[PDB]
Amino acid sequence: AFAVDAAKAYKDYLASGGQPITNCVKMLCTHTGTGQAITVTPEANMDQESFGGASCCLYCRCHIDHPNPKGFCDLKGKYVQIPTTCANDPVGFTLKNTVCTVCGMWKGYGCSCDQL
Amino acid sequence: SSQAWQPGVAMPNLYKMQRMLLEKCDLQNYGDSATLPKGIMMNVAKYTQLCQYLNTLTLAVPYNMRVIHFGAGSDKGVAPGTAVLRQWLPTGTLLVDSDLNDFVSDADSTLIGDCATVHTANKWDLIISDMYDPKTKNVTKENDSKEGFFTYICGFIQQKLALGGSVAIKITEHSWNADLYKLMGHFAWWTAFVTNVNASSSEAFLIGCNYLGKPREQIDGYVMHANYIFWRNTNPIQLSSYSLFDMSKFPLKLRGTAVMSLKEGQINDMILSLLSKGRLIIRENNRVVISSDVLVNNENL
Numbered sequence: 001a002f003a004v005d006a007a008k009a010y011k012d013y014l015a016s017g018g019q020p021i022t023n024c025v026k027m028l029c030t031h032t033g034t035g036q037a038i039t040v041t042p043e044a045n046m047d048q049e050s051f052g053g054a055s056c057c058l059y060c061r062c063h064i065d066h067p068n069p070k071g072f073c074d075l076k077g078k079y080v081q082i083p084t085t086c087a088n089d090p091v092g093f094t095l096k097n098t099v100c101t102v103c104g105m106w107k108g109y110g111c112s113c114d115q116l
Numbered sequence: 117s118s119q120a121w122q123p124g125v126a127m128p129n130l131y132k133m134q135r136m137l138l139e140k141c142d143l144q145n146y147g148d149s150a151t152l153p154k155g156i157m158m159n160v161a162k163y164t165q166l167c168q169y170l171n172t173l174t175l176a177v178p179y180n181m182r183v184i185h186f187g188a189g190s191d192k193g194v195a196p197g198t199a200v201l202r203q204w205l206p207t208g209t210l211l212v213d214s215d216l217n218d219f220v221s222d223a224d225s226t227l228i229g230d231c232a233t234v235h236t237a238n239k240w241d242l243i244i245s246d247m248y249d250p251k252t253k254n255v256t257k258e259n260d261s262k263e264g265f266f267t268y269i270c271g272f273i274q275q276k277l278a279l280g281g282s283v284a285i286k287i288t289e290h291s292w293n294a295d296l297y298k299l300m301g302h303f304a305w306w307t308a309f310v311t312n313v314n315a316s317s318s319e320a321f322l323i324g325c326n327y328l329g330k331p332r333e334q335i336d337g338y339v340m341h342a343n344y345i346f347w348r349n350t351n352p353i354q355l356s357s358y359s360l361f362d363m364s365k366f367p368l369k370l371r372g373t374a375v376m377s378l379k380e381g382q383i384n385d386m387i388l389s390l391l392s393k394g395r396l397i398i399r400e401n402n403r404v405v406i407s408s409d410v411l412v413n414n415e416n417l
């Protein structure tokens with residue numbers, strides 16, 4: 001019945017003023033890509049940075065089990081696009097935000113499915 | 117110039133043809149650093165320029181390509197180089213990496229331990245190594261051919277590199293091995309490639325392009341390393357990050373290079389010619405299986 005909650009721990013550490021996890025692997029790319037959130041190759045647009053996925057996953061970086069009951073990682077082996085304004089904390093960003101399953105963009109940072 | 121807009125500089129053929137004696141490496145821009153794009157790590161830049169140069173060579177690029185990457189962990193616990201290789205390689209490429217210490221990676225599989233503990237059933241289309249021990253940068257002792265992980269790398273190449281495949285192995289003034297230079301002559305072509313972002317270092321990548329499995333040319337590696345140092349000592353390379361800003365042609369092209377299983381008797385000159393041109397890979401196409409030897413000990417008493 002006891003499971004460590006690292007998501008909450010990082011959120012609380014950030015709220016208390018702790019420095020974001022560093023050394024997320026930022027990629028060189030054209031920055032003319034689709035802007036989708038998580039892709040098989042860097043896809044940053046003009047307003048994003050692309051990073052190697054594993055280096056942006058809290059669970060990978062902390063050496064802890066993934067919440068997936070299969071242990072599968074959403075980011076490992078892929079690239080994540082982070083808004084440039086949030087690129088100082090890619091791990092925080094991926095943790096706190098969710099990807100739209102329809103258009104593949106970050107909800108609130110590119111997803112327009114809920115327009116009209 | 118123009119060299120400042122390239123990803124780096126390869127050793128000119130004439131320097132490979134010399135018979136120099138080994139000297140100390142003295143680089144005019146030693147200690148200087150290139151201006152990297154904002155927030156970009158040296159190892160991302162370095163691997164990017166390495167891959168940009170590899171794009172200019174005749175690499176075989178088959179479907180279900182297999183690549184292994186040694187020395188893939190950093191002191192930050194991540195794998196910048198692997199992240200660049202995976203970006204460069206076609207989506208779906210099988211990518212394995214390894215290092216002595218634990219690290220998190222984007223590779224399909226990661227083996228932790230001394231490279232000598234790594235075993236694989238299958239053959240590989242491309243081998244990348246950044247293995248390096250900075251304790252070799254000792255100026256007060258003679259600079260002799262090194263063994264250690266270089267002995268492993270030479271055997272791994274002769275045993276597990278597919279015909280047609282290529283390698284890029286990191287060396288420096290003191291981190292080098294004579295047999296590896298000798299093995300360079302078992303490829304259709306070879307060079308020592310210096311990245312423009314790290315031009316102030318004696319680092320180079322020894323690249324062997326299209327493996328032939330036999331000596332095409334006889335190379336004395338003690339001499340060739342001296343030739344490499346002589347080149348570097350007499351040809352300052354201007355630090356440059358220019359090529360990092362143009363990534364439009366970065367992806368390695370999926371050439372669909374043919375893969376065939378073949379036996380030593382069937383390797384004729386036609387085959388050898390196709391291998392030498394980047395148009396054929398020879399190896400089985402079975403499943404890729406790897407393992408890491410683990411030493412078992414009970415310290416209780």
Ligand SMILES: Cn1c(=O)c2c(ncn2[C@H]2CN(C(=O)c3cccc(CN)c3)C[C@H](O)C[C@]2(C)O)n(C)c1=O
Pocket residue numbers: 141142143144146147148253255289316317318
């Ligand atoms: C280890 N090493 C070198 O040591 C070197 C070197 N190329 C030229 N040198 C120089 C370095 N020099 C320095 O002052 C110095 C020393 C340390 C750090 C820095 C940082 N600014 C500068 C000037 C010396 O008079 C000659 C000398 C020793 O050869 N290479 C490739 C190399 O690997």
Ligand SMILES: C[S@@+](CC[C@H](N)C(=O)[O-])C[C@H]1O[C@@H](n2cnc3c(N)ncnc32)[C@H](O)[C@@H]1O
Pocket residue numbers: 159187188189190191195196197198214215216217229230231232246247248249264265
């Ligand atoms: C320059 S670093 C790796 C940098 C890495 N490629 C990157 O992308 O940032 C050198 C690496 O070589 C590894 N390595 C060195 N010697 C090794 C050996 N005998 N066996 C296995 N790995 C080794 C070290 O652990 C060390 O991380």
Ligand SMILES: [Cl-]
Pocket residue numbers: 021061062
């Ligand atoms: Cl951490």
Ligand SMILES: [Cl-]
Pocket residue numbers: 334335336337339340
């Ligand atoms: Cl020679």
Ligand SMILES: [Cl-]
Pocket residue numbers: 279378379380398
């Ligand atoms: Cl064979």
Ligand SMILES: [Zn+2]
Pocket residue numbers: 054057058059060061066073074075076
């Ligand atoms: Zn993960």
Ligand SMILES: [Zn+2]
Pocket residue numbers: 100101102103104105111112113114
């Ligand atoms: Zn959407």
